[PDB]
Symmetry: C2
Subunit: 272 residues, 2 copies
């Protein structure tokens, strides 16, 4: 029976993106007097699967799942990510390709011509990274440039320490860049440290930006250019769609996909 | 699975998101799920959370000295009845933090985040430790070095630090009441070409992840997040099983703290 509880299963709250998304979900849910059970999956496929079927989450009327480990699939469900589940499930994602194209256009518009993509593999990519890469590549082609594999730098985990490590390593290997588009703010700020510790001027020598707008970038030094991917809209769409699914669980709603509008937020790290 | 509630100011605050992550992890170990609510740190919202869950873990910011359901409070001991409190070592940690700055040879130590004349709660305890450290070093408190802020956030730290710097106040160190304040202060110092730690040594309190990757990296205090979370969840589990006998007398837990030395105070 209806409890008025929805679940939110995310990798971990220690990740700013998920903590901020959770804050927005809780706030929106409270407007229709739902409460939120927050589960952590560690981004592990086995834990994501458990969230869908284990009686541990029986108090919930439905689930919002942000999967990372899943890609053989299995409680009303809305997924926060790219299309994944078949059947009567909705997916709410971000405009990865369009935002990556606009970010890259911004850097090229500053007169930078050797733009590094920090957080994607140069030859074999999958999912989100593949969409970001497609936007980046579109922008470079439009500016008469070919991709340079030395400028496409994979990173195992999109975190601060990994971005610092990778940035330091490519700088020390002698790779020449004039701008860096990092796949999230955490990567960007790790990169920022490695740049500053090597005396590289930001943005004088290397313009830098992130993605997500979750690092309180107004207060970094330099302040960090980023992309707001529509967290408020993501939360509202997710909660609204899930409520609809909870009301139609006994039955008929066609699967939907949506991706809210992004906004570039220009700060000091790219010339603001 | 049993069900507990966790009420914090907001998950957008790094310290609370990190603490929430630990609480949820400990609860999962103990076959508990967690309903998370936000209060904005406002008294009325905190009290309303008290008025689904088998027990509640409340982290208030807005309550000061001036239900039939189990309750554990992360904060100063203010509730009567069979309520357990887990309280960080504010005074001792502030004394140790101030001693750390004084040990570098600094003699004009600013306290960023407390009122100069009327303080309550946490700020009063922090001030006491700061004041004792200065007294032991033969120093007196200068009210111009005790700087109040809007709220303990990055914007407020940046705004207050910018105001005192542009005013010409002379300091050689800053002890900020939390890492968010310290990170905001760092920007205001850097944008003015003030060397950290060379001109001004800086530290915070909370050990948020972001402080490892600033340049300089931020010296801080880790107030005991693992013990806070474990103590809280474990005590709540005890009260839930008791179903209000109040046979367990109220407890006061005080987790151990640790100074984390980074580049902003010299390593
Ligand atoms: Mg119960
Ligand atoms: Na003094």
């Amino acid at each position: 029976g209806r409890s008025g509880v929805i679940g939110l299963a995310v990798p971990e709250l220690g990740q700013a993106f998920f903590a901020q998304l959770a804050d927005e979900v809780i706030r929106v849910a409270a407007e229709q007097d739902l409460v939120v059970l927050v589960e952590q999956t560690g981004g592990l496929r086995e834990r994501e699967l458990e969230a869908l079927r284990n009686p541990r989450l029986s108090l919930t009327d439905g689930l919002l799942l942000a999967p990372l480990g899943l890609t053989d699939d299995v409680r009303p469900l809305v997924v926060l990510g790219e299309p994944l589940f078949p059947g009567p499930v909705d997916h709410v994602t971000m405009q990865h390709e369009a935002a990556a194209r606009a970010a890259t256009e911004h850097l090229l518009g500053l007169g930078r011509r050797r733009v590094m993509l920090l957080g994607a593999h140069a030859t074999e990519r999958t999912g989100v990274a593949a969409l970001r890469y497609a936007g980046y590549r579109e922008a470079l082609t439009a500016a008469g440039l070919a991709v340079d594999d030395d400028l496409v730098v994979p990173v195992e985990t999109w975190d601060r320490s990994s971005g610092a490590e990778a940035m330091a390593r490519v700088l020390d290997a002698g790779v020449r860049m004039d701008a860096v588009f990092a796949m999230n703010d955490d990567l960007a700020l790790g990169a920022l440290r490695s740049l500053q510790e090597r005396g590289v001027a930001v943005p004088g020598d290397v313009a830098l930006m992130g993605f997500d707008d979750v690092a309180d970038g107004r207060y970094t030094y330099p302040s960090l250019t980023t992309v707001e991917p529509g967290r408020h809209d993501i939360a509202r769409a997710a909660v609204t769609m899930l409520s609809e699914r909870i009301a139609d669980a006994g039955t008929a709603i066609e699967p939907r996909l949506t991706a809210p509008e992004f906004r570039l937020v220009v700060r000091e790290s790219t010339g603001g």
